[PDB]
Design a protein around this nucleic acid. Structure first.
Lengths: 255, 255
DNA sequence: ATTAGTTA
DNA sequence: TAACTAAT
DNA sequence: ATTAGTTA
DNA sequence: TAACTAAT
């Protein structure tokens, strides 16, 4: 039961993550950018009730905080089902347009896999839960991602914003990927034999013997939990010779 | 009055033309071609009355003759005005598709004009009237261009066809152009100095002195009339230093 | 609720 | 040009 | 009356 | 995809 050996490493028992070694991120704007404030589109009580719990939880976790900002983007009530539960999706497109571009350093899955040697048949796959939220946003950049929120009967003043790298921000994947690479550089050095593939929040650890893939996995989980990241114990694929990774099925140095 | 000096050369007084030196044309079909017979689209009495005179005249001139053929294309009643006189336009497209292609030897106007020297400022422009009809169609090729014709009260059996190169046939421009070039080759040889440009039925004669452009024009008209072609005395532009040719205005070695 | 892009 | 298609 | 091609 | 545009 790896779940018991490494409590801090699993989202199930380690609590929300926070990459303690990473300095809060500063988001540079384009040279000519000025704040854009888009009024919130009227939302139905149904959508609001559906979204409320999520907002409340984020506030209690400190991921969302009240604020007053010249920036504002609309919240979209998206129901994953065909007519069930909602989830808040923020339309950060006008903000993305005003933020300075950075080089896309995340390798496409195909090329990433080309780094998998035939010798390592034992793989481990971990998915980091709420990856972006583990990265802090510098207070000077937080106002950029503000949106409107209310409760027709008592509630928050008006706007809330993120204290962590938000979903929907064009640079979140790249910044997370680069941050985790910095945090796992030492681990790679301490395990010259192991093969560690990273695709934003999806990790594939490779090894020759179940002993390696096993001892290596223990070190990774311990390392991850220690750095402040959290993996999904639910979806975790430990020391297998066949696993699903990035939409592929790895089985015998194949796919 | 050039009209009196050369009666045979003008459509106004020479009668319908007929290139006596040109052998009746044989139209080769593509390797796999089979006859196409498209029934005549119902025509209104108005259109028919409008077209009748033209058909009658062509028959009297021997340009149209009765026939029975496995080929048939529809006649289209086209009124050049917005609601006036009609003219018969035959849709030979399905026939054009079955006829073997030939190389397009007619030069585009731009390139043709590039053959105009600065030295020749005196030009003459002649337009051959009913050019295609001056070329005979071999009896073996005539059936190809058949169409339906009737007179609700006495008339022609059913189909008529052309005995001359018809309008609407994809190769008519090229074949006429090549035929006239053969008929005017000698004239070019007998007038090394003169500049003769041909664009299907549009002729431009160039010269240095009004004497040349004049004596040369007399020889051309005489030659043309003698060969069986006919120019429009109406639109004729004799020995001028400015003339309209192929949509251009020639004035001083310009345009 | 919008929109950048692709298809009909 | 109108419809789709995906995306935030 | 149809149609091959180009634009909306 | 619908409309045009030219052409026979």
């Amino acid at each position: 039961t790896w779940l018991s050996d490494f409590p801090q490493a699993w989202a199930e028992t380690g609590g929300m993550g926070l990459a303690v070694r990473q300095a809060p991120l500063i988001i540079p704007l384009k040279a000519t950018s000025t704040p854009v404030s888009i009024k919130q589109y009227p939302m139905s009580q149904e959508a609001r009730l559906g979204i409320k719990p999520h907002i409340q939880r984020l506030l209690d976790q400190g991921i969302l905080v009240p604020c007053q900002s010249p920036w504002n983007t609309p919240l979209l009530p998206v129901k994953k089902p065909g007519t069930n539960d909602y989830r808040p999706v923020q339309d950060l497109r006008e903000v993305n347009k005003r933020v300075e571009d950075i080089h896309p350093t995340v390798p496409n899955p195909y090329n990433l896999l080309s780094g998998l040697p035939p010798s390592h048949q034992w793989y481990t796959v971990l998915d980091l839960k709420d990856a972006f939220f583990c990265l802090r946003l510098h207070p000077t950049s937080q106002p950029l991602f503000a949106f409107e929120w209310r409760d027709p009967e008592m509630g928050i003043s008006g706007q809330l914003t993120w204290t962590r790298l938000p979903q929907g921000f064009k640079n979140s994947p790249t910044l997370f990927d680069e941050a985790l690479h910095r945090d796992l550089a030492d681990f790679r050095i301490q395990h010259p034999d192991l093969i560690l593939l990273q695709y934003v929040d999806d990790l594939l650890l490779a090894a020759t013997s179940e002993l390696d893939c096993q001892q290596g996995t223990r070190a990774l989980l311990q390392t991850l939990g220690n750095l402040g990241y959290r993996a999904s114990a639910k979806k975790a694929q430990i020391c297998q010779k066949q696993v699903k990774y990035l939409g592929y099925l790895l089985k015998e140095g194949q796919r």
